Write a protein that binds this ligand. Sequence first.
Ligand code: YS5
Lengths: 238, 10
Amino acid sequence: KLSEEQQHIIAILLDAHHKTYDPTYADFRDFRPPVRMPLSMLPHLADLVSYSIQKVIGFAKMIPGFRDLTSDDQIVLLKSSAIEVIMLRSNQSFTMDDMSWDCGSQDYKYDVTDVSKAGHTLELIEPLIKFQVGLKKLNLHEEEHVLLMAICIVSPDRPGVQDAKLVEAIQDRLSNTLQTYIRCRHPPPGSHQLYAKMIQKLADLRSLNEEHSKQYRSLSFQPENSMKLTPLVLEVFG
Amino acid sequence: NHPMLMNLLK
Ligand SMILES: C=C1[C@H](O)CC(=C/C=C2\CCC[C@]3(C)[C@@H]([C@H](C)[C@@H](CCCC)CC(O)(CC)CC)CC[C@@H]23)C[C@H]1O
């Protein structure tokens, strides 16, 4: 079974996600307005990204063991997993009806044309959509969603890490919870290699990250475009 | 140097 500490970890991660994720998307009215008719969607989406980073930061601080890390290990982990964890948390609004992210209204319904009007090409967007579809098909419990997001943040393989053993032991505690949770709470056939498919998704995110790094560096090459971004977005990415 | 990031985490 799931032990008391493992139940504790889950209760924490769920509540931490409930406090950083507003399924009504109310605060979307504060972003620079979307324009759909080049880079005409970069201001609105740069804003949603900047907001999303703040939300991921607030979630990170609630991960049991994250507070034991040094301020520097804390910065390296969040800096490299930011786009990955935002990709993961976006799956909660992604709809397979039309392959898009549906955030309340038609104005905040983003599709492949909107993401391409943010200055990014199909080389990344096609794998991004395929990723969201494969994640949706896993039909994870909200508990599995929060654990995966936590495991993706506390990864010891991220370059610049100092106390790799500490990050490792924090992640193992989250991994074991997840593995136990699938075996105790998740029933067949949905549980079938569900853990291995969840880890595969983490690998698909490493690929999406690496391509993101490239297309971001070319988009932000021209000052006219990094001029449309946010201070936080520029600090996290470059 | 990541002042905004260190602030949000403090
Ligand atoms: C609160 C939520 C909601 O579920 C919606 C939501 C969806 C975000 C999506 C869907 C539309 C396109 C986004 C916003 C992507 C951006 C266009 C980025 C491109 C994503 C390609 C990986 C652009 C960027 O390069 C990010 C630094 C510069 C603006 C990132 C996540 C994507 C964010 C999430 O935090």
